[PDB]
Ligand binder design. Structure first.
Ligand SMILES: Nc1ncnc2c1ncn2[C@@H]1O[C@H](COP(=O)(O)OP(=O)(O)NP(=O)(O)O)[C@@H](O)[C@H]1O
Ligand SMILES: [Mg+2]
Ligand SMILES: [Zn+2]
Lengths: 799, 459, 327
């Protein structure tokens, strides 16, 4: 059926078949169908992958598409720079962050399903190909159906929108395996379609084109008299809902709680809309339907509320539920999310009385501080922030009305009234959000507390102050005290000091918590302490490195696979709302991918071309990370340095290890430059020392000496840098005689930098500086006639 | 990118043609020579663009004072030649921003197709006309045509804003924070008429806040003082003591609470989108305030600031007053920028603390690191013979109405250099200290009390 | 660097760690070094004894200087005065003998010896006070003598004054940890607090920030926050200001001012000086940071401090005269 025009579009979009001999003919048929228009670029491949995603929610069928996307991301990294540059103007809808979100959603869908390990591994590899690239966005957005939104916009009446939502849900659940659910859905569909509202929905909705209209044709029937929903007048409609036990049973049974609450709402006589009354059989078989319909039932009750009796009853019961959450009791993370969704839905509805959005935010008399605290507990950071702002505004308005206060005073009143500090809650909300600038907005609370000071020092990269405070303070729990001490020591270098400190800590303490084992393994693999010898990340990395040294590739790949799966699983259970929560995971997956990629090079023969290509790929991907934070780039550079040093320490009888030595020297120079950019001085010094371990001083000087001089200049040591650069210039003058094209760039750059430094320090007259350094560099760059190069052009431009 | 500028220079005195010093005639003759040189090889484009410019000038010269009370749209009279011209495939849209390519060949550019027969009017002393331009792609574009005003100063200010944007782009600290200045294309056509970009989807902050019919203050705080009452009270204490002005301002501020924070609440119901828009608004305000202080931008009243409905980013218009010429006004401006109660309230509960202060510090650091380039650009501006940036009594009275050049340029350059180096009162101040001083000066009620009532300090 | 000889490599590492505080880090580093190496050269034993007596690690137990000091301190704790005096005599004799064999041409060669002999003399002098009964007058006289001799060392380098201050702090802490059933240990607590405040001021003068923070932490270990604020809180605010943390220092000083305003009602002469100094320092800091208009700063801090210092009529004092002059 390749020639079929109505089936060609859907055949083009199906997932590629697995790479096997049996699937050959279908594979060529699919590739020629898809590539009939022409070759697809990286952006087109990503767009095709995302269009395929919306069809079937089964992760097993997407394994081949995941591998194909990995291949395109691996061999089309050049187009990723153009893709990111094209999304700079509008980073909210960036295709890369959308792809990452879709992959993470697919991984979440793969949890608790057969063949999940392969899907998680493929997703981890895909997220390892693209690292923690700065997406210029803070909030994670989810893809929404444009057709569904347009259909919602078609209906103006709220009841018609409710009818459309219920009918869409019933159509969606009609394909479920359960037969009782299908029967209930069919009965509800017939009941809704038999009412007058269903008929009006059909008349309004028949203009548009939608398969749901065709699916609902057999259920619809034409009758002279419209179906009448009986209305019963209860003697006291409030007795069903006025029960504190009914609202909070909380016996670790959320399904029966939501079912009983929905049934109690349904049997109440307050409901006026006809379609909601007929949803009881569908509600009694599905808890998700009950959770979906509960906000609609509450809204319908409040619309018909008279004398504010229902409003007061719902306000006091919801407030009691929220207080029972705050307590310490021990509620299920589903009930809180359902109530948060109820509050969010009610916040978007217009009240019958004329008013603004602020008035609409108070359908019920609720204390939004408690709701914000629950949302923060439920990891709804933006919702918690909005609720906290609403609560603060409402309390300020109430105080102004009563009288007819700063943040600290308002927090004190909140603490003395409800026991929750607004400033503290805003502090954890902003920390969870992770935006660096917002942390300074709410800092007046707990200023003298050592934890806040240490967090501020770590955020500002004040590692020395953090180490001093960690050593000084004792009341802080030990586990995080040595965790911070080790982190501060590592960030300042001090590898030998950190190793001795770890040895002494292990000597004085026998109990070993997982955090200290994690840090010990991190220091062991970072310091190449190979004599130390579920599994965690750094432990897996250390085991993989030892397997690489011992040429045990099977366990090396098994360990890398296990680490990738564990990282993806750990990322799946997070909230997935803040972009900053993805960066450590993306960096870890990138490091794992780089180690896996270099594994094949280590296994087979070592050649100059393969190492050059690997270094070029590393440099290109590092340039793709130019906007990433140093905390997400430093582990990658450390792993690259460890890998290169492991390659060099391998037995090398071919006498061609100079290529690896040069590659490591260039990598360490780039690391020194990157650390200098981020106002770091210990790491560039360590990199210079590592370079000097494998290198020496000869007649022909090299670039790392200039890098060392720049590092010494950055350390506010002007005399040392000037003396080093002057010695470099003297050696260049005595050595080269306009014969080495490679030394031309080094000589020109050294002369220009020395002249600029002398001009800045005012240690020499302008005449001598011009005669000796600047015009000399210009003459060297120009008169040598070593043209036809781009680096020479850049050097001449700078001079 | 150059034909319109040369034609505008050559059409300095075509306003009275259609309806001084030797440098003027010399410039006109040189512009005419350049026009003939361009027309030598491509005459159809020059003729078409000249006809379009003449049509714009004729449309601008139309009085149209009878439709002042009409806000539904007035049909363009058939006598205007702008209606006759259609399908100008050789004229790129002046309103749009044309990307610059290294190659000399320009292709696939959006060209002017036709113009709508209906034009709108905007409020003000004079009556500007809003026309719609249809491009080759068929997408309508709104253009504002202004008369009896000089638009070259606005174009120069837009160029400086573009330079500030480019400086902010190449620094990673501000590129990460996406600190940019909203800009609109300004295309001067003569010494008295011109055309400029109309910011679609934007509303004045004063229109949103203190509107008489459906203002935010009236909708959210009906029991508070009305905008008219506050304006009348401030105008009454104008001819009084400074202490009386201060106590009147405090009394008004007591009965006028900011409600500008509700813009994001009523326009962005999603908490994630609301947070993104609020962060973008705070970053835009901080960056615009720092840029305005560096350039000495003045007359930043409610009607001179536009806010985008879609992106919640402030847009600054009417940039005629700059380089601290507002301090020379009869009522001096004692605030470097507008940081009124509404502006701080719209930043969230944290106020100026947090995102606003860090963004201001980053912008000030970027400005300090590029002091030489900014000083060179300002030197280029200040020696432009056609740049009438100096304050004159006529402009001073027009701005505030109620019912040696070399020495001045050198003083302005010295003041700018002191600002770039952190010198404020003869002492060296760090970036954080300078930012704190600017925030304190902007939010000081005493400085706001002295300001002109038309600036609406209480708003 | 690794090619440097190990003995001086860990000697420099220990010296750098000690000069930056990091007492727990230094102790763990020493324990790990002793774990990984069995050979023990005299230099490392000297540094280990120095850290043991400086950190009050009393469970570690010819003789050298720091070893003699540690043995004397343990003898002081155990009330073994005969061996305490014998150890001090032996240390003094060894120090003089070591100084005799030097060239004796450079004055700078005498300063470490003079500082060591001063520390030995101070420990010997406090030994008699420890042996006999503890009285307020004796402690006051000893503190006055210590302050006068420290003022005699105002031009000495910090490297020659820091060990003396460390020994004084150790001596005072040993006096406090002694069993005290007379309930008059508050005098020793106040003396130690004043000594630590002076140490923080001296370290701040020499552009040192870790030692003032450690002294503030030690003060906070033995002290708390009450309605009536004290001077060490102001010293902590000054230390935080010296650490280029202006917001923290300003917030601490503002909290101090608010507590003073709510607590005192022109009734405590002692709190008058603290309130005036806190107001003057906060006003100066706000003026330097340009975080407030001059009118509010004058109305709230400067003229308020002047009014507090003058109108309270708590005259006939020299500290009040200095505070009024500064305000
Ligand atoms: N570029 C623009 N984009 C959108 N709206 C604009 C623009 N320029 C002006 N407006 C609108 O026009 C109104 C009047 O401003 P403007 O056109 O500058 O006239 P004016 O106030 O009389 N100024 P001036 O002629 O310099 O005294 C503003 O309040 C805006 O609503
Ligand atoms: Mg205006
Ligand atoms: Zn509980």
């Amino acid at each position: 059926n390749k020639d079929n025009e109505n089936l060609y579009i859907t055949i083009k979009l199906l997932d590629p078949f697995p790479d096997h001999v049996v699937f050959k003919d279908l594979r060529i048929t699919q590739q020629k169908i898809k590539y009939s228009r022409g070759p697809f670029s990286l952006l087109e491949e990503i767009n095709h992958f995302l269009s395929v995603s919306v069809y079937d929610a089964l992760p097993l069928t997407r394994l081949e598409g995941l591998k194909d996307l990995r291949r395109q991301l691996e061999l089309h990294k050049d187009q990723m720079v153009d893709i990111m540059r094209a999304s700079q103007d509008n980073p909210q809808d960036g295709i890369m962050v959308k792809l990452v979100v879709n992959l993470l959603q697919l991984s979440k869908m793969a949890i608790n399903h057969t063949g999940e390990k392969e899907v998680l591994e493929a997703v981890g590899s895909c997220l390892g190909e693209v690292g923690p690239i700065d997406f210029s966005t803070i909030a994670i957005q989810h893809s929404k159906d444009a057709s569904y939104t347009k259909a919602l916009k078609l209906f103006e009446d709220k009841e018609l929108q409710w009818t459309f939502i219920m009918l869409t849900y019933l159509n969606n659940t009609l394909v479920e395996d359960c037969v009782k659910v299908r029967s209930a859905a069919v009965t509800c569909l017939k009941n809704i379609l038999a009412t007058k509202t269903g008929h009006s929905f059909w008349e309004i909705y028949k203009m548009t084109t939608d398969p749901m209209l065709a699916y609902l044709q057999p259920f619809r029937t034409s009758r002279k008299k419209f179906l009448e929903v009986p209305r019963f007048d209860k003697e006291n409609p409030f007795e069903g809902l006025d029960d504190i036990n009914l609202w909070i049973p909380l016996s670790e049974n959320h399904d029966i709680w939501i079912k009983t609450l929905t049934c109690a709402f349904l049997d109440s006589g307050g409901t006026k809309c006809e379609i909601l009354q007929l949803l009881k059989p569908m509600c009694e078989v599905k808890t998700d339907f009950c959770q979906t319909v509960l906000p609609y039932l509450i809204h319908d009750i409040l619309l018909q509320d008279t004398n504010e009796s229902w409003r007061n009853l719902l306000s006091t019961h919801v407030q009691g539920f929220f207080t029972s959450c705050l307590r310490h009791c021990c509620l299920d993370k589903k009930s809180q999310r359902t109530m948060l969704a109820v509050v969010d839905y009610m916040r978007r509805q217009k009240r019958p009385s004329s008013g603004t959005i602020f008035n609409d935010a108070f359908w019920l008399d609720l204390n939004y501080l408690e709701v914000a605290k629950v949302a923060q507990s439920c990891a709804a950071h933006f919702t918690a922030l909005l609720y906290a702002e609403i609560y603060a505004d409402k309390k300020s308005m109430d105080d102004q009305e009563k009288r007819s206060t700063t943040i600290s005073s308002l927090s004190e009143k909140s603490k003395e009234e409800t026991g929750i500090s607004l400033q503290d809650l805003l502090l954890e909300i902003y920390r969870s959000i992770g935006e660096p600038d917002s942390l300074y907005g709410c800092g007046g609370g707990k200023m003298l507390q050592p934890i806040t000071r240490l967090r501020t020092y770590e955020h500002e990269a004040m590692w020395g102050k953090a180490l001093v405070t960690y050593d000084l303070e004792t009341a802080i729990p030990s586990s995080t005290r040595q965790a911070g001490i080790i982190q501060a020591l590592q960030n300042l270098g001090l590898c030998h000091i950190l190793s001795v400190y770890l040895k002494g800590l292990d000597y004085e303490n026998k109990d070993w918590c997982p955090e200290l084992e994690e840090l010990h393994y991190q220091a062991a693999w970072r310091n190449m302490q190979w004599d130390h010898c579920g599994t965690s990340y750094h432990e897996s990395l250390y085991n993989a490195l030892q397997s690489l040294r011992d040429r045990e590739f099977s366990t090396f790949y098994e360990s890398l696979k296990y680490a990738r799966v564990k990282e993806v699983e750990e990322m799946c259970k997070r909230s997935l709302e803040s972009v900053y929560s993805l960066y450590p995971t993306l960096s870890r997956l990138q490091a794992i991918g780089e180690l896996e990629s270099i594994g094949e090079l280590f296994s087979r023969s070592v050649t100059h071309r393969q190492l050059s290509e690997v270094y070029i790929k590393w440099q290109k991907h590092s340039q793709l990370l130019k906007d990433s934070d140093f905390s997400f780039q430093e582990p990658i550079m450390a792993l690259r340095t460890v890998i290169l040093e492991i390659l060099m320490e391998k037995e090398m009888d071919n006498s061609q290890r100079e290529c690896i030595k040069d590659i490591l020297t260039k990598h360490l120079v780039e690391l020194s430059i990157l650390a200098r950019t981020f106002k770091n001085t210990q790491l560039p010094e360590r990199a210079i020392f590592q370079i000097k371990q494998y290198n020496s001083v000869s007649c022909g000087v090299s670039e790392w000496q200039l890098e060392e001089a720049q590092v010494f200049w950055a350390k506010k040591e002007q005399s040392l840098a000037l003396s080093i650069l002057k010695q470099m210039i003297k050696k260049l003058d005595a050595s080269c005689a306009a014969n080495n094209p490679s030394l031309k760039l080094t000589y020109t750059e050294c002369l220009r930098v020395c002249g600029n430094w002398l001009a800045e320090t005012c240690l020499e007259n302008p005449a001598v500086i011009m005669q000796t350094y600047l015009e000399k560099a210009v003459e060297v760059a120009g008169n040598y006639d070593g043209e036809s190069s781009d680096e020479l052009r850049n050097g001449k431009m700078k001079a | 990118h150059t034909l319109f500028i040369i034609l505008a220079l050559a059409n300095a005195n075509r306003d009275e043609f259609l309806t001084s010093s030797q440098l003027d005639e010399d410039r006109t003759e040189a512009a005419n020579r350049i026009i003939c040189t361009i027309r030598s090889r491509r005459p159809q484009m020059v003729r078409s663009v000249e006809a379009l410019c003449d049509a714009y000038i004729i449309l601008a010269n139309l009085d149209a004072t009878q439709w002042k009370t009409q806000r539904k749209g007035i049909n363009i009279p058939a006598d205007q030649p702008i209606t006759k011209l259609k399908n100008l495939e050789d004229v790129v849209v002046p309103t749009m921003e044309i990307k610059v390519d290294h190659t000399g060949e320009y292709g696939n550019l959006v060209t002017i197709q036709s113009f709508k027969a209906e034009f709108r009017l905007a409020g003000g002393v004079n009556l500007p006309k809003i026309i719609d331009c249809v491009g080759s792609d068929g997408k309508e574009r709104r253009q504002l045509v202004k008369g009896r005003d000089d638009l070259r100063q606005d174009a120069v200010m837009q160029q400086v804003f573009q330079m500030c944007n480019t400086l902010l782009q190449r620094n990673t600290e501000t590129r990460k924070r996406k600190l940019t200045i909203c800009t609109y294309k300004v295309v001067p056509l003569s010494q008295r008429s011109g055309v400029l970009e109309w910011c679609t989807g934007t509303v004045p902050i004063g229109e949103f806040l203190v509107n008489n019919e459906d203002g935010a203050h009236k909708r959210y705080r009906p029991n508070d003082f009305s905008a008219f009452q506050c304006q009348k009270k401030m105008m009454e204490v104008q001819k009084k003591s400074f202490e009386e002005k201060y106590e009147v301002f405090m009394d008004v501020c007591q009965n006028f609470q900011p409600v500008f924070r509700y813009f994001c609440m009523e326009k962005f119901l999603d908490p994630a989108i609301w947070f993104e828009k609020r962060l973008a608004y705070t970053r835009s305000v901080a960056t615009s305030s720092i840029v305005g202080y560096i350039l000495g931008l003045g007359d930043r009243h409610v009607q001179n600031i536009l806010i985008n409905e879609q992106s919640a980013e402030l847009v600054h218009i009417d940039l005629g007053v700059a380089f601290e010429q507002g301090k020379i006004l009869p009522t001096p401006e004692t605030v470097p920028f507008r940081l009124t109660r509404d502006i701080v309230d719209g930043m969230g509960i944290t106020g100026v603390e947090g995102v606003f202060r860090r963004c201001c510090e980053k912008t000030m650091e970027v400005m300090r690191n590029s002091q030489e380039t900014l000083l060179t650009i300002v030197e280029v501006l200040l020696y432009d013979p056609l740049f009438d940036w100096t304050m004159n009594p006529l402009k001073a009275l027009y701005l505030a109405q109620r019912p040696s050049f070399n020495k001045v340029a050198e003083r302005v350059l010295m003041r700018l250099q002191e600002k770039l180096k952190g010198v404020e009162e003869g002492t060296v101040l760090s970036v954080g200290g300078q930012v704190n001083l600017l925030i304190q000066q902007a939010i000081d009620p005493k400085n706001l009390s002295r300001l002109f009532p038309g600036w609406k300090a209480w708003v």
